[PDB]
């Protein structure tokens, strides 16, 4: 009596491939188009925010979420994989880093914690494994900003710019041809706007794009209004209102 | 839980993980054995067809699992380590315990009970590789020789001779040796031996590991050199009995 | 208790008390002292009665054993380790040990192992282990040689048993011998202390050069 | 305790070991020696509690053994000495300890310089050109530090170590009668067996 | 239960082989390309990132390169996902070598613990093995410069000259012939760049899709010093030998 | 705070004879100075001619007997009703007694019966583990006082014959039944006028190959 | 795979097939038990000179009053045997005496019942059944001289005799008419040796046959090469002059 | 471990011919404050068994539920089950036991010491001793607590042989029972003047008398007045 399931449910096809991963792909192709710039000055992350329901709140919706302080993410696939996923990366980067080393775990070995997660879920059975790709965009103080890849076996490659979702080639570019490094994080909000009404008809609005930053600091973003101490976050959301003035920005 | 089957019976009484283990041995590279009366010839192969292997960190075919008894095999090198490793403890818990230098028998027992375990027991699968397991028993002068297969089952032979063209090697040998006269010189012992695999090698005398063990503790790695010289030999030989 | 072994031409001498008393009169003169392990192999009861009753008895057991596992006889060495490796375990939390693992291998010859519940492992020649070790080694050393016939070999080893008995509240009621031989070992006897006592004061004028 | 001197002296290390065990007036053993081969050349004597010695010496024997084989290569005394301290080092914190002091007198052949290391039972291991542990070597101390500085030979040693055992049987309270000496260096291990002034 | 709703791909074959295995090194051949070249002052190596662009960053020089030592590191060819266990693993089983005996590991010691780590995923468990081969680039003091392979079957072999990945083929029959059994780094570097150019189709041989390092002796730098050659060094290079073509 | 060691009490007494053997026990049950039971059998059958008394502290006397009932019951099922010899039950005994040590146990165990060879045989336990086989034994609180009466008129020894007394003695002989139980009598009447821990009733099982036999004896009550 | 727990319409599992179809393989093995013994014979088989023959029999003691011979798969005969040792050594130490043959079998055919997925009643850590029968004989001081057949499905019955191996049919056919119950030790060897030398193609030498026996004042003796050859010597002259 | 804080004093018994009485005060003692006054400590368990128990209350309660499960679990596979292999004296004593010997094997005791008494509807008289100590015993008259020490020899008059018990007769043996415990509320002032008393009868099942009161009252205190709070100054 209980499960005796310990069989990989992950195995060897004839040509070298693994069939889960093949499965898992194709609906991550079919998932949310998203997009990621390092603009040199910053990074800037958009990804689709999407309404259930006029009468729905997207508020509690999670396209972009905070994996670490100064670090967002955002992906195309299989959200139910990804909301899990988000939250056994904060737990690993909260407890064996934030006072062990004093600070957030840098961008590249967050990357490979993550990568971690996927493969061992690929590895062993009882279980298949994730169904997603990440854009993982970050700063990081002893690294600059930087944007990697997450692969949905958790294979990584280092991008300063790409896109993930449905019509990804085309949007890759229009962000290759109008951003070449050295540029302010505002422009490369324009230049993304752009790259997505393209990508994107039908109905297109700033209502219809979450859009976050990583690349600026407030006081408030310290979390006091006292004497410094430490640098703290970096990430901020904009609201749909902020978003619908850099649309009226040409 | 994974102690459930993975090993299953045959119709025909045998077991199919079983028969299957002894096609990746044949497949493989050779090892043979030859007894004198004074020592145990073993004979290893290692035909290097590249010449991009360097040669001294490419794996040798020899192992100490004691320091009077030596294991060879013909096989999969990966499950080779997982059983060589096991056969070592076993030789040094003896000497813990028992306060004695070890005998050959109880070794061979040890290597027989491995395998016969993953056969029986669930959720593992036998080895890839049969070995040869020689050795001399402590204050004492005459051969042993022993075979084992990842059956788990075990004999003793005179000689024996495991890998690839196992059929043509113990056909050829038992030309050349009787129990009732084996020869008593390491020098003619050895030249049969090297006889034996050069016919199977094809080009080989550096591709060939001759090691010959004698009484307690005496064993020695015969190299090219003298190798090379027996082959002109019996290029020599060839030529007196035609 | 005091219990003793020395090896000589002839093989080991083992001699041995037996006293068992409620207060100090002595209400049976046997008691448990030699545990029998094989045929060959003795293994003496002292320390902790109980450790020694079940741990002699399982070592003969696991002796057994060996013989039909690897068809060999045992060393007392090895027989001795075994003991050992399972002793220091269950130290600090009790266990009290004191045997000499006594043998007469064909495969060594006569061999002695003292063994106690520290984990000690020792080899030597001639042993009294005891209370009344230091004055029973006095009488065994003066008239002590290797080469010696078992007659007189057995009755050194009874003097310095009664020696020990006099001075030490903690043996003497009978006096227990044994002889461990190549083929195993050869009771000879309970000899009573009261006989034996008169006789042994008038003969060996040993702390009776004048009689005292 | 069990008295154990070591002195590193320029063409091999010399390690002394008591050599009988006293019962009253007499010595009922005088043929001890205490001391386990590790490797042919890296050696290990022994003092401390005397069943916790052969539990622990053969431990860490069977040990090294086993990588001996299994790499069919020999290992250095200084790779012996830090595998002995960590293994200490885990024992002081369980609940029974040994209490063994060793010294092992290594000749590192792979360097082709003589080592001696000192370990204390805690796990605090030095390397030194002459030792001593307990009580022995406030006599001893006095005589080494005055009498010897580094760079003297294998005789010097012997008449030294001679020196040290008689004022230790006459003038120290603790009796483990005399020594028996060895010899580690580059040809192995040879028991000195004169101590008539060596 | 799990009988019928589960098979058994890690039984053997009516050949003698594994499934999984045999379909492993498969995964390797399509993968990118890494090359070892031992020299007798030093390593040589070099990697083929096989597709690069302006969109992924190729500043990032350590992406099959990884140290697992300060002696010993390896190149990968293939997927970052599955070298990443054993590589946090290797670097674990290092730690444990220099704590015991305060001195490093061997290379095959640490190649031989890997393949029966390896052997493991499909000799119990039922699990799934990894999918990536790795070129040891090591010392010893016992065997000089030391140059390995092994793979997810967990046989490994001696060398000083392999490859695995894509276009193993090519560069090995090139290789061979240009081979001088005994030969310093900077020649290395020169037979290494000619075999490269003529193993990447037409003009595509850039620093920029490459990843270099090499293990030199130095004598500004401490022996065995591995350098990992980020983009600037693999240009200069490049124009030396004037390969760039 | 809490050890629930203590003591209770009573008096056994095993005699091996010529062909027979008896377990003789008191059947007075204290603790301190209150009477727990004036009759309380203190000898048992445990069945295969073993009967078998537990002397000492009762807690551990009941614990001891419900783990060897067991395996009475188990040696039997396991091995097709082949009774249980003195010998075996005495070293299933010693492991159960082993088996608690660091709950030690305070006991003077008596076994008595007939051996599977035909001779009457007696063995005593020390209380966490040994045995050994004695002729005869005397048990209990009262051991110190009916072993030197015992030692002379039974075993014969510390009594000679007035001549000498010492090349002169008197022999053994082994005794009878009526003999025994003469003896047995005579230690019990004068042992319960000095221990408060005999008295009430003497049972005295006599154990012989036509079975268990009963005897009682009366004594002393307060 | 194949199922662990699934029966056929009559009610008999697969496994237990499936378990009688290797035993069928081996190299017989024939057991009488008379009055003074059992006899306990094999046929080793095999004659080579680059074979040790002399060097391997499939006659191994238990106990110094306890020996199986087999026939079967011999691999597994080895697991058997560990199991049979520790629970025959742990009752020597707590009753002091010998284990009964019939004891020892249901012992051993406990573990016998293990194979495959695991159960709540059995948690089960093997893959397939033991593809040995065995004839362990023995001596108890209650029940004398005996011996006893046990199948690896959990069955043990207690013969006078019994032959189990490939060439079983014959041989037990042969075991009846030879059977009596005035037979003894000395004639039980002989008749041994007639039916091993009528079922062979081959000549009959002690290194293709190997004899043992059972006597109470020595326990499980093996019959040594030295004996077992006289035996065979005497056996063929005697036939040998019948023609 | 654990040494008391709440005490429960005095359960005291003895067979007649043909059953057993058993009486009991009601109390749960905080030391010398009397403060549970009804507490029961008569437990029955069925029609048969009365279950008395002295010693810490915190033991109390918990052996009070342990019974009250007992018979749940004794309707469990029939009904109507009351002498086919449940509800016997022997069977709630044995179990007991057995939970009484392991916690003081392990040294976190049950701090209790009871008394089962009840008539066997199969056979004839249950009376059996159980302490804190694992010692127990039978004998025809059996008290706890004070009871032992001084209601016992009262009992003994009457009974504490075999024969003495036929001999003993419903009157006889409920004199003594009214008799000892007149004495336990005079020199132990912890046992409460409420008390219940149970005789176990063949002839007529269970009759339990609850709260029953102590009368035939002791004033003989009056005849010693020398004063104590009578003064003129």
Same mark, same amino acid.
């Given at each position: 009596?209980?499960?005796?399931?310990?069989?990989?449910?992950?195995?060897?096809?004839?040509?070298?491939?693994?069939?889960?991963?093949?499965?898992?792909?194709?609906?991550?192709?079919?998932?949310?188009?998203?997009?990621?710039?390092?603009?040199?000055?910053?990074?800037?992350?958009?990804?689709?925010?999407?309404?259930?329901?006029?009468?729905?709140?997207?508020?509690?919706?999670?396209?972009?979420?905070?994996?670490?302080?100064?670090?967002?993410?955002?992906?195309?696939?299989?959200? %139910?994989?990804?909301?899990?996923?988000?939250?056994?990366?904060?737990?690993?980067?909260?407890?064996?880093?934030?006072?062990?080393?004093?600070?957030? %775990?840098?961008?590249?070995?967050?990357?490979?914690?993550?990568?971690?997660?996927?493969?061992?879920?690929?590895?062993?059975?009882?279980?298949?494994?994730?169904?997603?790709?990440?854009?993982?965009?970050?700063?990081?103080?002893?690294?600059?900003?930087?944007?990697?890849?997450?692969?949905?076996?958790?294979?990584?490659?280092?991008?300063?710019?790409?896109?993930?979702?449905?019509?990804?080639?085309?949007?890759?570019?229009?962000?290759?041809?109008?951003?070449?490094?050295?540029?302010?994080?505002?422009?490369?909000?324009?230049?993304?706007?752009?790259?997505?009404?393209?990508?994107?008809?039908?109905?297109?609005?700033?209502?219809?794009?979450?859009?976050?930053?990583?690349?600026?600091?407030?006081?408030?973003?310290?979390?006091?209004?006292?004497?410094?101490?430490?640098?703290? %976050?970096?990430?901020?959301?904009?609201?749909?209102?902020?978003?619908?003035?850099?649309?009226?920005?040409? | 839980?994974?102690?459930?089957?993975?090993?299953?019976?045959?119709?025909?009484?045998?077991?199919?993980?079983?028969?299957?283990?002894?096609?990746?041995?044949?497949?493989?590279?050779?090892?043979?054995?030859?007894?004198?009366?004074?020592?145990?010839?073993?004979?290893?192969?290692?035909?290097?067809?590249?010449?991009?292997?360097?040669?001294?960190?490419?794996?040798?075919?020899?192992?100490?699992?004691?320091?009077?008894?030596?294991?060879?095999?013909?096989?999969?090198?990966?499950?080779?380590?997982?059983?060589?490793?096991?056969?070592?403890?076993?030789?040094?818990?003896?000497?813990?315990?028992?306060?004695? *230098?070890?005998?050959?028998?109880?070794?061979?027992?040890?290597?027989?009970?491995?395998?016969?375990?993953?056969?029986?027991?669930?959720?593992?699968?036998?080895?890839?590789?049969?070995?040869?397991?020689?050795?001399?028993?402590?204050?004492?002068?005459?051969?042993?020789?022993?075979?084992?297969?990842?059956?788990?089952?075990?004999?003793?032979?005179?000689?024996?001779?495991?890998?690839?063209?196992?059929?043509?090697?113990?056909?050829?040998?038992?030309?050349?040796?009787?129990?009732?006269?084996? *020869?008593?010189?390491?020098?003619?012992?050895?030249?049969?031996?090297?006889?034996?695999?050069?016919?199977?090698?094809?080009?080989?005398?550096?591709?060939?590991?001759?090691?010959?063990?004698?009484?307690?503790?005496?064993?020695?790695?015969?190299?090219?050199?003298?190798?090379?010289?027996?082959?002109?030999?019996?290029?020599?030989?060839?030529?007196?009995?035609? | 208790?005091?219990?003793?072994?020395?090896?000589?031409?002839?093989?080991?001498?083992?001699?041995?008390?037996?006293?068992?008393?409620?207060?100090?009169?002595?209400?049976?003169?046997?008691?448990?002292?030699?545990?029998?392990?094989?045929?060959?192999?003795?293994?003496?009861?002292?320390?902790?009665?109980?450790?020694?009753?079940?741990?002699?008895?399982?070592?003969?057991?696991?002796?057994?054993?060996?013989?039909?596992?690897?068809?060999?006889?045992?060393?007392?060495?090895?027989?001795?380790?075994?003991?050992?490796?399972?002793?220091?375990?269950?130290?600090?939390?009790?266990?009290?040990?004191?045997?000499?693992?006594?043998?007469?291998?064909?495969?060594?010859?006569?061999?002695?192992?003292?063994?106690?519940?520290?984990?000690?492992?020792?080899?030597?020649?001639?042993?009294?282990?005891?209370?009344?070790?230091?004055?029973?080694?006095?009488?065994?050393?003066?008239?002590?040689?290797?080469?010696?016939?078992?007659?007189?070999?057995?009755?050194?080893?009874?003097?310095?048993?009664?020696?020990?008995?006099?001075?030490?509240?903690?043996?003497?009621?009978?006096?227990?011998?044994?002889?461990?031989?190549?083929?195993?070992?050869?009771?000879?006897?309970?000899?009573?202390?009261?006989?034996?006592?008169?006789?042994?004061?008038?003969?060996?004028?040993?702390?009776?050069?004048?009689?005292? | 305790?069990?008295?154990?001197?070591?002195? @590193?002296?320029?063409?091999?290390?010399?390690?002394?070991?008591?050599?009988?065990?006293?019962?009253?007036?007499?010595?009922?053993?005088?043929?001890?020696?205490?001391?386990?081969?590790?490797?042919?050349?890296?050696?290990?004597?022994?003092?401390?509690?005397?069943?916790?010695?052969?539990?622990?010496?053969?431990?860490?024997?069977?040990?090294?053994?086993?990588?001996?084989?299994?790499?069919?290569?020999?290992?250095?005394?200084?790779?012996?000495?830090?595998?002995?301290?960590?293994?200490?080092?885990?024992?002081?914190?369980?609940? @029974?300890?040994?209490?063994?002091?060793?010294?092992?007198?290594?000749?590192?052949?792979?360097?082709?310089?003589?080592?001696?290391?000192?370990?204390?039972?805690?796990?605090?291991?030095?390397?030194?050109?002459?030792?001593?542990?307990?009580?022995?070597?406030?006599?001893?101390?006095?005589?080494?530090?005055?009498?010897?500085?580094?760079?003297?030979?294998?005789?010097?040693?012997?008449?030294?170590?001679?020196?040290?055992?008689?004022?230790?049987?006459?003038?120290?309270?603790?009796?483990?009668?005399?020594?028996?000496?060895?010899?580690?260096?580059?040809?192995?291990?040879?028991?000195?067996?004169?101590?008539?002034?060596? | 239960?799990?009988?019928?709703?589960?098979?058994?791909?890690?039984?053997?074959?009516?050949?003698?082989?594994?499934?999984?295995?045999?379909?492993?090194?498969?995964?390797?051949?399509?993968?990118?390309?890494?090359?070892?070249?031992?020299?007798?002052?030093?390593?040589?190596?070099?990697?083929?990132?096989?597709?690069?662009?302006?969109?992924?960053?190729?500043?990032?020089?350590?992406?099959?390169?990884?140290?697992?030592?300060?002696?010993?590191?390896?190149?990968?060819?293939?997927?970052?996902?599955?070298? =990443?266990?054993?590589?946090?693993?290797?670097?674990?089983?290092?730690?444990?070598?220099?704590?015991?005996?305060?001195?490093?590991?061997?290379?095959?010691?640490?190649?031989?613990?890997?393949?029966?780590?390896?052997?493991?995923?499909?000799?119990?468990?039922?699990?799934?093995?990894?999918?990536?081969?790795?070129?040891?680039?090591?010392?010893?003091?016992?065997?000089?410069?030391?140059?390995?392979?092994?793979?997810?079957?967990?046989?490994?072999?001696?060398?000083?000259?392999?490859?695995?990945?894509?276009?193993?083929?090519?560069?090995?029959?090139?290789?061979?012939?240009?081979?001088?059994?005994?030969?310093?780094?900077?020649?290395?570097? =020169?037979?290494?760049?000619?075999?490269?150019?003529?193993?990447?189709?037409?003009?595509?041989?850039?620093?920029?899709?490459?990843?270099?390092?090499?293990?030199?002796?130095?004598?500004?730098?401490?022996?065995?010093?591995?350098?990992?050659?980020?983009?600037?060094?693999?240009?200069?290079?490049?124009?030396?030998?004037?390969?760039?073509? | 705070?809490?050890?629930?060691?203590?003591?209770?009490?009573?008096?056994?007494?095993?005699?091996?004879?010529?062909?027979?053997?008896?377990?003789?026990?008191?059947?007075?049950?204290?603790?301190?100075?209150?009477?727990?039971?004036?009759?309380?059998?203190?000898?048992?059958?445990?069945?295969?001619?073993?009967?078998?008394?537990?002397?000492?502290?009762?807690?551990?006397?009941?614990?001891?007997?419900?783990?060897?009932?067991?395996?009475?019951?188990?040696?039997?099922?396991?091995?097709?009703?082949?009774?249980?010899?003195?010998?075996?039950?005495?070293?299933?005994?010693?492991?159960?007694?082993?088996?608690?040590?660091?709950?030690?146990?305070?006991?003077?165990?008596?076994?008595?019966?007939?051996?599977?060879?035909?001779?009457?045989?007696?063995?005593?336990?020390?209380?966490?583990?040994?045995?050994?086989?004695?002729?005869?034994?005397?048990?209990?609180?009262?051991?110190?006082?009916?072993?030197?009466?015992?030692?002379?008129?039974?075993?014969?020894?510390?009594?000679?014959?007035?001549?000498?007394?010492?090349?002169?003695?008197?022999?053994?002989?082994?005794?009878?039944?009526?003999?025994?139980?003469?003896?047995?009598?005579?230690?019990?009447?004068?042992?319960?006028?000095?221990?408060?821990?005999?008295?009430?009733?003497?049972?005295?099982?006599?154990?012989?190959?036509?079975?268990?036999?009963?005897?009682?004896?009366?004594?002393?009550?307060? | $795979?194949?199922?662990?727990?699934?029966?056929?319409?009559?009610?008999?599992?697969?496994?237990?097939?499936?378990?009688? +179809?290797?035993?069928?393989?081996?190299?017989?093995?024939?057991?009488?038990?008379?009055?003074?013994?059992?006899?306990?014979?094999?046929?080793?088989?095999?004659?080579?000179?680059?074979?040790?023959?002399?060097?391997?029999?499939?006659?191994?003691?238990?106990?110094?009053?306890?020996?199986?011979?087999?026939?079967?798969?011999?691999?597994?005969?080895?697991?058997?045997?560990?199991?049979?040792?520790?629970?025959?050594?742990?009752?020597?130490?707590?009753?002091?005496?010998?284990?009964?043959?019939?004891?020892?079998?249901?012992?051993?055919?406990?573990?016998?019942?293990?194979?495959?997925?695991?159960?709540?009643?059995?948690?089960?850590?093997?893959?397939?059944?033991?593809?040995?029968?065995?004839?362990?004989?023995?001596? $108890?001081?209650?029940?004398?001289?005996?011996?006893?057949?046990? +199948?690896?499905?959990?069955?043990?019955?207690?013969?006078?005799?019994?032959?189990?191996?490939?060439?079983?049919?014959?041989?037990?056919?042969?075991?009846?008419?030879?059977?009596?119950?005035?037979?003894?030790?000395?004639?039980?060897?002989?008749?041994?040796?007639?039916?091993?030398?009528?079922?062979?193609?081959?000549?009959? $030498?002690?290194?293709?046959?190997?004899?043992?026996?059972?006597?109470?004042?020595?326990?499980?003796?093996?019959? $040594?090469?030295?004996?077992?050859?006289?035996?065979?010597?005497?056996?063929?002259?005697?036939?040998?002059?019948?023609? | 471990?654990?040494?008391?804080?709440?005490?429960?004093?005095?359960?005291?018994?003895?067979?007649? !011919?043909?059953?057993?009485?058993?009486?009991? !005060?009601?109390?749960?003692?905080?030391?010398?404050?009397?403060?549970?006054?009804?507490?029961?400590?008569?437990?029955?368990?069925?029609? #048969?068994?009365?279950?008395?128990?002295?010693?810490?209350?915190?033991?109390?309660?918990?052996?009070?539920?342990?019974?009250?499960?007992?018979?749940?679990?004794?309707?469990?596979? #029939?009904?109507?089950?009351?002498?086919?292999?449940?509800?016997?004296?022997?069977?709630?004593?044995?179990?007991?036991?057995?939970?009484?010997?392991?916690?003081?094997?392990?040294?976190?005791?049950?701090?209790?010491?009871?008394?089962?008494?009840?008539?066997?509807?199969?056979? !004839?008289?249950?009376?059996?001793?159980? #302490?804190?100590?694992?010692? /127990?015993?039978?004998?025809? /008259?059996?008290?706890?607590?004070?009871?032992?020490?001084?209601?016992?020899?009262?009992?003994?008059?009457?009974?504490?042989?075999?024969?003495?018990?036929?001999?003993?007769?419903?009157?006889?043996?409920?004199?003594?029972?009214?008799?000892?415990?007149?004495?336990?509320?005079?020199?132990?002032?912890?046992?409460?003047?409420?008390?219940?008393?149970?005789?176990?009868?063949? #002839?007529?099942?269970? /009759?339990?008398?609850?709260?029953?009161?102590?009368?035939?009252?002791?004033?003989?205190?009056?005849? !010693?007045?020398?004063?104590?709070?009578?003064?003129?100054?």
């Amino acid at each position: 009596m209980t499960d005796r399931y310990s069989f990989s449910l992950t195995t060897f096809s004839p040509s070298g491939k693994l069939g889960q991963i093949d499965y898992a792909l194709t609906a991550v192709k079919q998932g949310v188009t998203s997009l990621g710039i390092k603009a040199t000055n910053g990074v800037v992350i958009a990804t689709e925010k999407k309404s259930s329901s006029p009468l729905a709140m997207s508020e509690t919706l999670s396209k972009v979420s905070l994996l670490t302080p100064d670090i967002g993410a955002v992906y195309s696939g299989m959200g %139910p994989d990804y909301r899990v996923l988000v939250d056994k990366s904060r737990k690993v980067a909260h407890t064996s880093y934030k006072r062990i080393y004093g600070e957030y %775990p840098p961008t590249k070995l967050l990357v490979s914690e993550v990568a971690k997660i996927m493969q061992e879920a690929t590895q062993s059975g009882g279980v298949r494994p994730f169904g997603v790709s990440l854009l993982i965009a970050g700063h990081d103080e002893f690294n600059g900003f930087s944007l990697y890849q997450v692969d949905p076996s958790g294979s990584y490659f280092p991008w300063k710019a790409t896109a993930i979702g449905k019509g990804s080639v085309a949007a890759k570019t229009f962000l290759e041809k109008r951003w070449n490094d050295e540029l302010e994080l505002e422009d490369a909000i324009h230049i993304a706007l752009l790259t997505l009404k393209e990508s994107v008809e039908g109905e297109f609005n700033g209502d219809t794009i979450e859009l976050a930053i990583i690349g600026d600091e407030n006081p408030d973003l310290l979390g006091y209004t006292g004497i410094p101490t430490d640098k703290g %976050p970096r990430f901020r959301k904009l609201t749909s209102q902020e978003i619908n003035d850099r649309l009226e920005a040409l | 839980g994974y102690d459930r089957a993975l090993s299953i019976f045959s119709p025909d009484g045998h077991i199919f993980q079983v028969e299957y283990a002894l096609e990746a041995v044949k497949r493989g590279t050779c090892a043979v054995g030859v007894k004198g009366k004074n020592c145990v010839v073993l004979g290893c192969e290692r035909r290097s067809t590249l010449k991009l292997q360097d040669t001294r960190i490419t794996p040798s075919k020899v192992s100490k699992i004691d320091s009077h008894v030596v294991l060879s095999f013909s096989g999969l090198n990966a499950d080779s380590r997982i059983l060589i490793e096991k056969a070592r403890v076993e030789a040094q818990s003896h000497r813990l315990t028992l306060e004695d *230098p070890v005998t050959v028998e109880y070794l061979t027992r040890y290597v027989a009970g491995v395998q016969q375990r993953y056969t029986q027991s669930g959720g593992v699968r036998p080895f890839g590789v049969s070995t040869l397991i020689a050795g001399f028993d402590p204050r004492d002068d005459e051969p042993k020789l022993y075979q084992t297969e990842p059956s788990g089952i075990y004999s003793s032979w005179s000689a024996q001779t495991i890998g690839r063209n196992s059929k043509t090697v113990r056909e050829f040998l038992e030309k050349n040796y009787d129990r009732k006269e084996p *020869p008593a010189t390491v020098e003619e012992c050895v030249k049969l031996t090297v006889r034996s695999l050069l016919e199977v090698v094809q080009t080989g005398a550096k591709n060939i590991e001759i090691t010959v063990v004698k009484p307690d503790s005496d064993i020695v790695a015969l190299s090219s050199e003298e190798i090379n010289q027996y082959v002109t030999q019996i290029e020599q030989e060839k030529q007196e009995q035609q | 208790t005091t219990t003793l072994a020395f090896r000589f031409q002839g093989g080991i001498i083992v001699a041995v008390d037996s006293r068992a008393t409620a207060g100090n009169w002595v209400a049976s003169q046997t008691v448990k002292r030699v545990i029998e392990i094989n045929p060959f192999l003795l293994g003496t009861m002292a320390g902790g009665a109980a450790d020694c009753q079940f741990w002699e008895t399982w070592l003969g057991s696991q002796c057994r054993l060996h013989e039909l596992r690897e068809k060999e006889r045992i060393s007392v060495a090895a027989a001795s380790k075994i003991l050992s490796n399972l002793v220091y375990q269950y130290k600090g939390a009790g266990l009290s040990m004191g045997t000499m693992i006594c043998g007469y291998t064909r495969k060594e010859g006569p061999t002695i192992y003292y063994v106690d519940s520290d984990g000690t492992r020792l080899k030597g020649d001639i042993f009294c282990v005891g209370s009344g070790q230091t004055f029973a080694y006095g009488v065994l050393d003066s008239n002590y040689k290797w080469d010696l016939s078992v007659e007189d070999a057995l009755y050194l080893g009874k003097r310095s048993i009664l020696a020990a008995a006099h001075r030490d509240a903690y043996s003497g009621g009978s006096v227990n011998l044994y002889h461990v031989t190549e083929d195993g070992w050869i009771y000879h006897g309970n000899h009573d202390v009261g006989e034996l006592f008169w006789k042994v004061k008038e003969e060996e004028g040993s702390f009776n050069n004048v009689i005292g | 305790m069990d008295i154990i001197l070591g002195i @590193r002296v320029q063409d091999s290390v010399i390690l002394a070991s008591s050599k009988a065990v006293t019962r009253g007036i007499s010595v009922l053993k005088d043929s001890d020696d205490k001391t386990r081969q590790l490797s042919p050349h890296t050696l290990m004597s022994f003092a401390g509690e005397a069943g916790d010695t052969v539990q622990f010496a053969e431990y860490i024997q069977a040990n090294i053994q086993l990588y001996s084989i299994r790499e069919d290569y020999e290992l250095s005394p200084q790779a012996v000495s830090s595998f002995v301290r960590q293994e200490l080092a885990k024992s002081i914190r369980s609940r @029974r300890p040994y209490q063994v002091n060793v010294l092992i007198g290594g000749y590192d052949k792979k360097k082709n310089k003589p080592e001696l290391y000192q370990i204390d039972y805690l796990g605090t291991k030095v390397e030194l050109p002459y030792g001593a542990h307990g009580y022995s070597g406030f006599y001893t101390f006095s005589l080494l530090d005055h009498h010897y500085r580094p760079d003297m030979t294998t005789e010097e040693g012997l008449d030294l170590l001679k020196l040290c055992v008689q004022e230790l049987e006459k003038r120290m309270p603790m009796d483990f009668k005399g020594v028996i000496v060895k010899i580690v260096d580059k040809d192995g291990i040879r028991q000195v067996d004169d101590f008539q002034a060596q | 239960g799990s009988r019928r709703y589960d098979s058994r791909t890690t039984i053997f074959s009516p050949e003698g082989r594994l499934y999984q295995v045999e379909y492993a090194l498969e995964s390797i051949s399509h993968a990118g390309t890494a090359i070892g070249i031992m020299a007798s002052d030093g390593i040589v190596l070099a990697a083929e990132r096989k597709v690069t662009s302006t969109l992924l960053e190729q500043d990032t020089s350590t992406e099959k390169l990884y140290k697992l030592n300060d002696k010993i590191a390896v190149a990968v060819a293939g997927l970052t996902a599955d070298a =990443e266990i054993l590589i946090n693993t290797a670097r674990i089983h290092a730690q444990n070598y220099l704590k015991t005996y305060n001195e490093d590991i061997p290379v095959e010691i640490l190649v031989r613990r890997l393949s029966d780590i390896k052997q493991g995923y499909t000799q119990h468990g039922g699990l799934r093995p990894f999918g990536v081969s790795f070129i040891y680039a090591g010392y010893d003091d016992r065997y000089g410069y030391q140059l390995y392979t092994s793979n997810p079957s967990g046989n490994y072999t001696g060398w000083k000259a392999i490859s695995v990945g894509a276009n193993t083929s090519a560069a090995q029959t090139l290789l061979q012939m240009d081979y001088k059994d005994d030969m310093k780094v900077d020649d290395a570097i =020169e037979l290494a760049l000619k075999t490269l150019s003529k193993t990447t189709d037409s003009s595509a041989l850039t620093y920029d899709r490459l990843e270099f390092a090499t293990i030199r002796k130095g004598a500004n730098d401490g022996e065995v010093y591995q350098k990992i050659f980020k983009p600037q060094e693999i240009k200069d290079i490049l124009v030396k030998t004037g390969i760039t073509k | 705070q809490f050890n629930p060691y203590g003591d209770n009490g009573g008096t056994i007494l095993g005699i091996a004879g010529e062909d027979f053997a008896v377990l003789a026990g008191d059947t007075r049950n204290i603790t301190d100075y209150s009477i727990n039971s004036r009759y309380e059998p203190k000898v048992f059958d445990c069945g295969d001619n073993i009967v078998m008394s537990a002397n000492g502290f009762a807690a551990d006397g009941d614990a001891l007997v419900k783990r060897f009932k067991n395996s009475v019951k188990w040696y039997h099922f396991d091995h097709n009703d082949k009774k249980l010899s003195i010998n075996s039950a005495a070293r299933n005994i010693q492991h159960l007694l082993y088996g608690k040590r660091f709950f030690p146990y305070y006991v003077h165990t008596i076994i008595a019966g007939l051996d599977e060879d035909g001779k009457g045989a007696v063995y005593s336990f020390d209380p966490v583990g040994s045995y050994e086989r004695e002729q005869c034994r005397a048990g209990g609180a009262a051991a110190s006082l009916i072993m030197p009466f015992l030692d002379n008129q039974v075993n014969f020894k510390n009594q000679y014959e007035p001549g000498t007394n010492g090349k002169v003695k008197k022999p053994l002989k082994y005794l009878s039944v009526e003999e025994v139980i003469k003896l047995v009598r005579d230690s019990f009447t004068s042992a319960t006028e000095r221990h408060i821990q005999v008295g009430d009733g003497l049972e005295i099982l006599i154990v012989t190959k036509d079975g268990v036999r009963k005897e009682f004896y009366e004594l002393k009550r307060d | $795979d194949r199922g662990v727990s699934t029966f056929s319409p009559e009610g008999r599992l697969f496994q237990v097939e499936y378990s009688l +179809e290797a035993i069928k393989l081996g190299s017989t093995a024939i057991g009488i038990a008379t009055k003074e013994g059992v006899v306990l014979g094999v046929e080793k088989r095999a004659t080579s000179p680059l074979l040790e023959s002399d060097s391997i029999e499939k006659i191994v003691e238990i106990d110094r009053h306890i020996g199986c011979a087999m026939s079967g798969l011999t691999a597994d005969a080895r697991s058997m045997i560990e199991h049979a040792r520790t629970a025959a050594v742990t009752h020597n130490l707590y009753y002091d005496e010998d284990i009964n043959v019939e004891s020892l079998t249901q012992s051993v055919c406990d573990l016998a019942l293990r194979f495959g997925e695991g159960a709540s009643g059995e948690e089960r850590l093997m893959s397939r059944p033991f593809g040995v029968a065995l004839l362990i004989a023995g001596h $108890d001081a209650d029940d004398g001289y005996q011996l006893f057949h046990a +199948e690896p499905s959990g069955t043990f019955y207690r013969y006078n005799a019994k032959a189990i191996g490939s060439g079983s049919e014959g041989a037990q056919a042969e075991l009846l008419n030879e059977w009596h119950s005035s037979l003894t030790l000395k004639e039980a060897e002989l008749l041994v040796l007639k039916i091993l030398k009528q079922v062979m193609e081959e000549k009959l $030498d002690e290194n293709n046959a190997q004899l043992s026996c059972i006597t109470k004042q020595d326990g499980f003796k093996i019959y $040594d090469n030295e004996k077992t050859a006289e035996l065979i010597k005497e056996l063929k002259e005697k036939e040998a002059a019948e023609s | 471990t654990q040494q008391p804080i709440v005490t429960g004093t005095s359960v005291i018994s003895m067979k007649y !011919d043909n059953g057993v009485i058993i009486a009991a !005060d009601n109390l749960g003692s905080y030391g010398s404050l009397l403060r549970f006054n009804g507490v029961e400590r008569l437990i029955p368990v069925g029609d #048969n068994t009365v279950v008395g128990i002295s010693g810490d209350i915190s033991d109390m309660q918990h052996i009070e539920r342990l019974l009250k499960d007992l018979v749940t679990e004794n309707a469990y596979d #029939n009904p109507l089950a009351d002498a086919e292999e449940a509800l016997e004296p022997s069977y709630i004593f044995e179990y007991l036991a057995t939970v009484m010997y392991q916690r003081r094997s392990k040294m976190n005791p049950l701090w209790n010491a009871i008394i089962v008494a009840g008539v066997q509807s199969n056979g !004839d008289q249950f009376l059996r001793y159980v #302490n804190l100590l694992g010692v /127990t015993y039978s004998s025809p /008259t059996l008290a706890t607590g004070f009871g032992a020490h001084m209601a016992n020899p009262l009992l003994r008059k009457v009974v504490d042989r075999e024969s003495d018990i036929p001999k003993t007769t419903v009157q006889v043996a409920e004199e003594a029972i009214v008799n000892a415990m007149r004495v336990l509320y005079y020199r132990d002032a912890r046992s409460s003047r409420n008390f219940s008393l149970a005789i176990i009868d063949k #002839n007529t099942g269970l /009759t339990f008398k609850k709260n029953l009161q102590v009368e035939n009252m002791k004033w003989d205190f009056a005849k !010693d007045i020398k004063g104590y709070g009578t003064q003129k100054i």
